[model samples]
Target chain A: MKITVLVGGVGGARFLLGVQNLLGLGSFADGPSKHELTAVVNIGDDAWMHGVRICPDLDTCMYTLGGGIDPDRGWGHRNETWNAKEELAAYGVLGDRDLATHLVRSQMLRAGYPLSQVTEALCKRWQPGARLLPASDERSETHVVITDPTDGERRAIHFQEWWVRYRAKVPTHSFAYVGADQATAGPGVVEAIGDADIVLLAPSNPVVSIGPILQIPGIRGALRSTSAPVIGYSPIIAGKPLRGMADECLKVIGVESTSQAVGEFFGARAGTGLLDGWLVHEGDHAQIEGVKVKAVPLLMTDPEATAAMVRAGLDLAGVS
Target chain B: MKITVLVGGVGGARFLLGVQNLLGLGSFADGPSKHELTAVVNIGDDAWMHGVRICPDLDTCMYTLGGGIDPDRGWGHRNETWNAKEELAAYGVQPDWFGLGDRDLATHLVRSQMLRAGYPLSQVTEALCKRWQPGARLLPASDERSETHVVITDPTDGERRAIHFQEWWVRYRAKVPTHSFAYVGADQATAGPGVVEAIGDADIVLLAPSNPVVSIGPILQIPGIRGALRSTSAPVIGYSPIIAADECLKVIGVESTSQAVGEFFGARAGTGLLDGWLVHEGDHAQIEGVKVKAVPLLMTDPEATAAMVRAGLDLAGVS
Candidate 1:
């Protein structure tokens, strides 16, 4: 079975680990199974820092699935040295090991390779069991508009600044995927979505995470037109996000921070939305017109528990 | 006294330490004195590697004078880690032969970004000096791209071609059969900021014991730099880079002797650069219209090197 997943960073990466586990692929899989997985990752979190291109979501998924992730931090390389970062800090800037990835990517990018191709090249080393495709080859970034607390100024800053620097605590306006209007799906993304036997939305942030991927022009069309049933597992469980500040992001877009509201926001494929079925946490009642809804265990505490969540979502989608 | 020196890498860095010792300016100085020093450094040894600009000569001088250079190797950062280089090698990145330590990579990152933002190499060096605080003000010979290209017989086909000085020096260990050297882009290059003025207003100018062919040779080849040395009111004296025979001098068809190099510089009264030349105690010769003084010139330590600087000053009639 070909399972295509739409994912964001940390939370989404964990969910993919579960999907892979249930499907019997990747490092945490049960056994060698003939299930093929492809993850369409959000590149909206991409940013240029210290003259190197950094793709947050793509790397998290790659590292986590490839077993290179620092299991505790759930991001970056395990046992990574910050010799370069410490030195940069002294110079009032910023790696040596993780930097090699950035350096190789930057050099390839500067030489005119698209982000899709660069990601493909990097995968040669990590060999993350599933095929990872960036959402778009275009330079699409999520920028958040916020009113400064220190001054009465309104400005749009990169999502990372709001997410990391401000902890997303300031007065927010809206999130914009800056270049999504002109972007098509990356090389194989639209095709993967259109041809998959089952399409799953990982429990990624509904606003900035899955939001940016959906905002891409052709991706939405692909999801709506694919013959496969689109099943979404709720990132929100019991009126709270599983990880990250998804509630804050959901509030910015004025979506209620609940499984029912988010499921409704994605809506039903029968009436101008993408989800064919939705899985909410157990005891959290969620109903959307024209879409089947099931309650399931959603915490990704361990491989088996997460796999159980994946099984419930698949069952709801009527995947026999 | 305003002292200006033309220098290269390791040898030049050590020579500058001696000058600071004699003039009482840096760490090895005798006592505090009012002598100001400026170094018009050779940038021909510069190259771009791993997407970052590496200015070897300038860095050697900066790290040496600032007390950051590895004392044993005579270049690069002290107690440096090679995690980046080791990783890069694993990736099979080119130029894995050259050393790029983790600490040194920071400097390259800052410099590469600043250069990309359109700052001249001279201004960039000054900003970098703010961190190192190398006592002498270091100025690159030119802001323009002027690299030393060594012409050599290709080991494969025996066809003569030019490669960057570094490839010739480090990769081949300068062993390939060489023909001549070219200062690529130097003819059209103008002197860097304050280079001409430093020479013009100096009380004295000295040449450090660096690789004469690729180092001090390329600095003089800059369009206006040689003129500044010739036109300056201050006396120009040079210490022989050749304490012993050198491959660099041999490639240029010049003998690696104090007498041979002094005559190669010729006389300032003629069409040459030196008004006075300081040779080693035993390696002696006199050039017409140029003063020659023989002195014990081995720079084993700062004190010994300081005495050599004092001898050069005495020959220039400045002491």
Candidate 2:
């Protein structure tokens, strides 16, 4: 079976770990199967910070799959130090070990390799079990319109500024997918989806994570035409996110931030939406029209539990 | 009294440390004075390694004067780590033996960026010294690039070509049969800010025992610098790199690093550089036109090196 999944940053990375563990790449306590995996990661979360190309979601997925992800942080490399950061701190710089990763990537990028090719080259070092494709090579970024907490002046800032610097606590207006309207899917993204036997949407932020990726027209068009069934696990289960500020992000898009509301927002591909089936936690049985709704355990508590969640999504797709 | 010294990286730095010990800062377990110290460092030994603007002599002088140089390596930061170099090498870059510590690399990165932003090398060194607080005012000898290249006979075809000063020094350990070093940009290279003026205003100009081929030779070759030293009313005095040893002459391919340098930098009366040249007690050779002083040239310890500096000053009639 060929499994294609979409990912954002931390939460999405954890779910991918479960999917890989089930697919026989990582520590698969579950019985292994012949499963090939491809991930379409959100580059809308990427930005040039401190003059470095920082792809939050792509790195999260790549590091996790490569087993170098700090299990505690769910991001960055394991046992990373901050000497370079300290060395640059009095002036300004990046992570000690992580900075090397960025430097190597930036060198490639500056040498005129596109983001897709750079990611491919970096994977040469990492050898992440699954093929990781950035959502788009185009410079698509998520910008958030918000009012400053201090003076109430409203403006659109890059998503990282809202999330990383402000903690996303300031007043929210809306999420804008800059460059999404024109971006082509990164090399192999569309082909990966169209060729897969199953397409699983990760339990990541719908409004800001999976949403901006879908906002890119080529990917949406690919998802619309993929012969495989599209299975989505609820980002909002039991009226709360398994992790991150998905609720607040969904509120910016005016979705009710609930299991039923998010599932309905994706809706059924039968009516110009992309969900063939949706997984809602048993606690929140969201009976929706034009889609198969499965009520099951949605929490990714451990490898077995999350593998079961992935299995449920597969079963819903009739591929389990 | 205003005192200025010209230096290269390691050997020259040892001489300056003695001068500093004789003056005010560093290991003044002997005594301290109010004299102002300015260092004019050679940049001909500088190079770009892995996109970094590495000024070896400048760093050696900076860290040594600031009391932060690794006493073991004779260059770079104290207690340095090699994680950055290790990281770069894992990706397959830089020469195997070249050292670039993370802390030192940060300084280079900052400097490289500043140079790319149009700041002069002298200004960049000044900014770096703001943090290093090198006990003396630090000045690069020239803003223009002056590369030292050694012409070595190629074993493959006997075709002669030149490599960098570093490859000449470290790789061959200066063992290669070679021709004279060519300073590529020395003609257009002007003295850095305060270099000539410091020489002009100094009571005495001290030439350190740095490598004559690549170090002090390049600094003297700068367009306006030698003229300023020549134009100085104050006496120009030099410390020898080799006193007891023909042992020292081998690395730079000099027949007489001590006498050769003295004769080369002849009396300012005869359109050359030095007024006084100090040699070691172990050698008896002297240049014809300049005042010659025989002293213990070994900087074995601070007190002994301080004695050398004291003798050089007394010979210059400045003490």
Candidate 3:
């Protein structure tokens, strides 16, 4: 069986770890793996800094799966040096270890390789067990509209700057999927979803994470038409995200931060939405029309516990 | 008096230091400086590595004059990290032997970015020099790509080919059997801003002891530059880059003796640029139609080098 998951950065990477564990594909796996895994990661938080193309979610998933991730911070290379970053700051522009990835990616991208091909090449070194794919090969970053602090003018700031630099504290307007109008799903993205036995939306931010993936012209249509079940694990446990500032993003889009609301936001695939099953936390109440809702242990404390959650989601989708 | 020096990398930078010292333009100087100095630098050694433009000769001059040069290595930043270089090697990026220090990489990044933004190489050099403040006005020999390529037989393929000057010097240590040198784009390249003007308006012009075939050669080859050197009122003098038998001279089939190099840069009366030639003491150099002088050429210290500079100027009948 092949599991294709649409994912975001840190939280998404963690969820993928659980999927890999449950599918018997990991560093410590006994022999042949039970299933192939494909992760169609969000590039919405991707940005160009100091002339290098940085894909935050792709790197996170690659590093975490490849065992190169900094376990403490849950992103970037382990034992990374800030020399490059510090130097860029001093020069008023913008890591030796992490920079290696950026440098290679930037050079490749500049040399005219698409993001999908670049991701595949980068994965050779990381050997990230699951194949990683960008949602779109084109430049489709999520930009947040915020009123400028000094000039009081409305401007669209990159999603990374809003989430990271400002901590999403600034007054926000709507999120714009900058280049989605012209972007087709990346090579194999639609196929991965349409051909999968199970499609999981890893408990990533619904607004920016899963939103941009589905926003690509043909991807949403593929999800609606795929015969396989599409189950979304709630990133929000109870009424808040387990990690990341999903509530701030949810507020910008005017969606209440709840599993039920997010499910209703996706709606039923029968109509103009996508979701065959919705997995929420055990105690969290979620009753959505035309969707099988299951309450289970949602905290990804470890790989085994997270795998149990995966199993529950699979069960709710009637795949077991 | 305005003293303009046509120079190359390490040796050139060292010679400039001596010129500054003798002309009272150093950190230790007490009062106002003696002479205005300008350096017409060679860009022949410049190349792009990992998509970053690297002007080795320009950097050596900048770092050395700005007091950032590593004393042991004679080039690059004083305290450098090779993390980027090491990582680049791990990725199997070509020719990792030409190590780029992390601190030094900052300059390349700035320079490469500026170049990409449509600024010419000369303007980029000026902007970079603002940070280093390498007292003398630094100018590239040309704004265009005029790299020095060495024609040699590839030992592995046994085929005659042209590789970058750096590949010949750094990677092969100039040990590979070679044939003629080509200044790749020098024919089409016009002299950089202030290059011909510096030569024409100078009170005195001195060629520093850089690699004659690859270093000083390319600068002289740029269109309108050699003519400017010949026609300019400033007495065109040359200090022999060859201390002894240099392998670079052997590749060009020129004898590596100072006298041979002096003749190679023939008298201004002829079709060459040398009005006077400076050779080391005891090195015999008697060229017709050119004034020849003997002096200590080893750049052991700045003061000794300054003495040599004074000797060269005296030979030029300046002061």
Candidate 4:
């Protein structure tokens, strides 16, 4: 079966590693591999620093799949030396490694190529296994509107500073999709969503990671109308995010930090937030109309454990 | 009296030193202390090595007169080290310190600004000396023909070799200025004849211990001049350059060494080559028309010893 996975960083990379390991092995007694996977990556957290354009989520997915990722931190390449970074810091460029990456990206950008082409060229050198595609090559930025408590006025800040530099510590009054209202899905994103037998949303921040993908007008319509079962794994477990500042982000958007609330936020079935099947933890087995709810062990411990989760997803969609 | 000194290397420098000393001390009492000394220098020994143009005789004059010359070796600046030269050699360039003067001469040549200024050697030199003013107005023998050549055939195949005069003097010392008619004076020689009036006709011809063949030959042959003493009433006194074949260079030729021949060649009086001559002990003097005597002391010992020899030559001339 052909499967399409929408992913972000750390949590998403770990879950995909499990999916790959499980589906990578022959499932039938003597048949070929069970699933062909393509990851529609999120570029919402992408930013230019020290002159290089960096796509953190895309690199996280690529490195995780390609086996170059540091197994401990689950981010950045293993055995990575900070020599270039240190030298750049000595030269007083802020965010040395980030700056180096941005410098290269800016050079390529200035050389008249789009960011998609630059990512392709960079991936050729990296030899990242999965065919990683940016959600949209167009200039779609995520901006956050925050209110200065002292001034009582809201100001829009680039998504990266709002997330990385400020660490989402400021009072974000509201968030915006910026250019997503007018933007179309990049080349393969719609087809990957429409033609798949199964679409798996990794346990990423629902409001930010998966929200950006659904925000693109055409992509959401395609996902809702497609024959494939669009499934989402809950990023919220218990009363908090499994990882990251997802709870803080959700709070800014006025979504309560709970599994049932997140499911209600994505909504149930067609004409709502693109969900045909929802996989929540066994603790929150509450179901929505037109959406199947499967309560499985949501924590991905290993390849077999994640395959069990995927089996549960396929079972909920009545695939087997 | 104004005196024009035709100079070569160290020997010529010493004679000029003695003349300056004598002139400075009022030894020539009858003449005014205001004396003009123009040196008609030889450029035949000049060569380009290590990308720099070096004129040995011109530098010898400058350093000898400017009080910077090493008194021991009688060449190069005193207290000089070879840091630059050694570094250049380390880079595989030739560093013959003997040819290079510590104080660069090319700077003067280049700074003069006019490549084709065509100033006679006298003016060009005065322009050069305007900085240090080495106490003498120096000039080249002639600007026309730079004469330096060798007479040897190739050692393997007997073919004549014409080489620069420096190759003979520096590379082979003057072992060859004998059979080798190594240089011929410029064809159209204009004496900085003002040199004659500047150093009066009363001035003596002191055959500065310079090599008689090459150094003095070109000076005497300048168009309007015969010999310095040929026109001056002043007697020409000679000093013997033969201290031994070791100390003095025994100039070689296809014939015998030129040391024995040079004395006969430079004897005194009407038929002789000089008037009053002084030689060291053990050197046989062929006294004909010249008054020849032997001195026990070497000319380079103490400054006073050379002065003593000058006194003896004066007594011999009954000056």
What are the DockQ scores of the candidates, in order? 0.58, 0.29, 0.46, 0.01
Measured against the true structure, the TM-scores of the candidates, in listed sequence, are 0.92, 0.83, 0.93, 0.47
- What are the interface RMSDs of all the models? 1.4, 2.6, 2.0, 21.8
For model 4, residues A36-133, the per-residue Cα lDDT tens digits are: 77778777777644323677787777556656566786556444444434333422332222223343455567669776676676566455545677
Query: Which of the two, 2 or 3, has more DockQ?
Result: 3
Pick the DockQ winner: 1
For candidate 4, the chain B TM-score comes to 0.74
Instruction: Give candidate 1's error at residue B146 in angstroms.
Output: 1.1
The best candidate by lDDT is 1
Ranking by lDDT: 1, 3, 2, 4
lDDT of 3: 0.85
List TM-score (chain A only) for every prediction.
0.93, 0.91, 0.94, 0.85
- Candidate number that wins on DockQ, 2 or 4: 2
lDDT tens readout by residue for model 2, A43-80: 88788755557888887777777777777875566666
| CA shift of B182, model 1, Å | 2.5
lDDT string for model 2 (B80-149, tens) is 7777666656656447667778777777777777887799998888887776666688789988898877
Instruction: Report the number of clashing residue pairs per model.
Output: 1, 1, 1, 16
Question: For this target, which candidate reaches the highest TM-score against the unseen true structure?
Answer: 3
lDDT of each: 0.86, 0.79, 0.85, 0.61
Better of 1 and 2 by DockQ: 1
lDDT of 3 by residue, A151-268 (tens): 8898998987888775456678898989989999999999998999999988888888888888888989999999999999887765445454448888898998888889998888
Residues A1-320 of candidate 1: C-alpha lDDT, one tens digit per residue: 88899999788888888888887787856667788899999999898877678888998887788888777875576666777777677666524767777777888898999998988888877777889999998889999988888887988889988887764577888888888898888999999998898899989888888889999889999999999999998877664454434377888888887888999889899999999999888888887899998887889997778889888877888785
Residue B192 in candidate 4, Cα distance off native in Å: 53
By TM-score, highest first, what's the ranking? 3, 1, 2, 4
